[PDB]
Structure formats: structure tokens, C-alpha cells
A paper describes a structure:
In this work, we report the first SSX experiments with viscous jets conducted at [name] beamline BL13-XALOC. Complete data sets were collected from all proteins and their high-resolution structures determined. The high quality of the diffraction data collected from all five samples, and the lack of specific radiation damage in the structures obtained in this study, confirm that the current capabilities at the beamline enables atomic resolution determination of protein structures from microcrystals as small as 15 µm using viscous jets at room tem­per­ature.
In addition to the standard model system, i.e. proteins such as hen egg-white lysozyme and proteinase K from Tritirachium album limber, we included phycocyanin from Thermosynechococcus elongatus, human insulin and the [name] domain of α-spectrin (α-spectrin-[name]) from [name].
Residue numbers in the entry: 7 to 62
């Protein structure tokens, strides 16, 4: 349910969100292997699964 951003990522498309290294994001949906939907600063969208780490 929470994930740590391991790298910066800037949205490159409408369904994407931007994040900074060290940001703590709310994990909305990780059914897809490559793209995870998250919430950052009351924005929602996708980031690469590999660029974040679950906390549990």
C-alpha cells in the first residue's frame, strides 16, 4: 500500500505521473507487471514498477 520512489520519473504521457527520488507514494494498483498506478500529491497515475519499492 505504500511505495518508495527509487529514482526521479517525469510523466511522458497523459496516464503518467511525475515523482522524485525518496517520495512516498500510495499504491493504488499493481496488477500490471510494468506499470503501477499510484497517488502523488493528490494526482493519480502510472509509473514504472521497477522505479519503486513496496514497504509492507
Amino acid at each position: 500500500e505504500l511505495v518508495l520512489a527509487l529514482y526521479d520519473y517525469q510523466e511522458k504521457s497523459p496516464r503518467e505521473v511525475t515523482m522524485k527520488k525518496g517520495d512516498i507514494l500510495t499504491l493504488l494498483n499493481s496488477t500490471n507487471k510494468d506499470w503501477w498506478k499510484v497517488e502523488v500529491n493528490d494526482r493519480q497515475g502510472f509509473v514504472p514498477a521497477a522505479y519503486v519499492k513496496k514497504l509492507d
